[PDB]
């Protein structure tokens, strides 16, 4: 089980906006800016979406966004597409030298 | 006012700054072995770290 807490699904339709809450505490999220988000299509390898709080890599569209808030940093999608109807997993540094994941956030687009 | 016992061999760290031109001071300049002390007018920032 993940040390980080995060939702498992948020549903809707194209064109909306979302906020998905990955949560930690002082030791992993609070003290550090090392937070990332990874897309996970059904049965596919993961894809990086957001790195270092919010830095979109080439190939990631401005349909995606995120920002830090204390001990919870969240994934903010905008302009939804059914093509992006994937799972989403937050990721963050956790002290010592380790990397931790969280959540099962299946996007749904009717 | 304000003598800091800070010990260094080559560069002088956190010292007081001069008022004017970067004055050279030396006890003698016929005796080349006399250590020559340079006192800057403006500072140069230095940062050191052990990443380990």
């Amino acid at each position: 089980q993940s040390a980080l807490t995060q939702p498992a699904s948020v549903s809707g339709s194209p064109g909306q906006s979302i906020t998905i809450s990955c949560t930690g505490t002082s030791y992993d999220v609070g003290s550090y800016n090392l937070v990332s988000w990874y897309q996970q299509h059904p049965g596919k390898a993961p894809k990086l979406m957001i790195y270092e709080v919010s830095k979109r890599p080439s190939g990631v569209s401005n349909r995606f966004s995120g920002s830090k808030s204390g001990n919870t940093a969240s994934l903010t999608i905008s302009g939804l597409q059914a093509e992006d109807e994937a799972d989403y997993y937050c990721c963050s540094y956790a002290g010592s030298s380790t990397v931790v994941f969280g959540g099962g956030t299946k996007l749904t687009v009717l | 006012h304000g003598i800091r016992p800070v010990v260094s061999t080559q560069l002088l760290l956190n010292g007081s700054l001069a008022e004017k031109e970067i004055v050279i001071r030396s006890e003698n300049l016929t005796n080349n072995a006399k250590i020559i002390i340079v006192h800057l007018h403006t500072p140069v920032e230095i940062v050191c770290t052990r990443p380990n």
Binding site: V35, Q40, E52, D87, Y93, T98, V99, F101 | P51
Partner: protein
Amino acid sequence: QVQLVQSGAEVKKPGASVKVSCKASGYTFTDYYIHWVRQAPGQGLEWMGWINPNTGRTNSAQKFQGRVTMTRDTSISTAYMELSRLRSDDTAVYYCARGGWIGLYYDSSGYPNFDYWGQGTLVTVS
């Protein structure tokens, strides 16, 4: 073009140690951190550890210390995931990914910047 490649789907029996291999294709295998990620079949990702090729130093996650240890050989451009005392709870897909950039100064060992991924293997035990 750079790519990460791995051994295909794997078959074993429980208790036996597993030796997943990860090939670094089309880039300097000396210059980037490599990270291992587990994915139980159809489930979320679990983090395993990393390896520094140019240094050879490693660290396995606290959940596996003393049981998982990674090695490499530069002459054949491959990284290895050794995992012994296999429980059937280890039923999962195992991934290989390219991490941050290595530098003499600075420290990117723990950054979650997994850039590309290997196509992975699924281990068959029960």
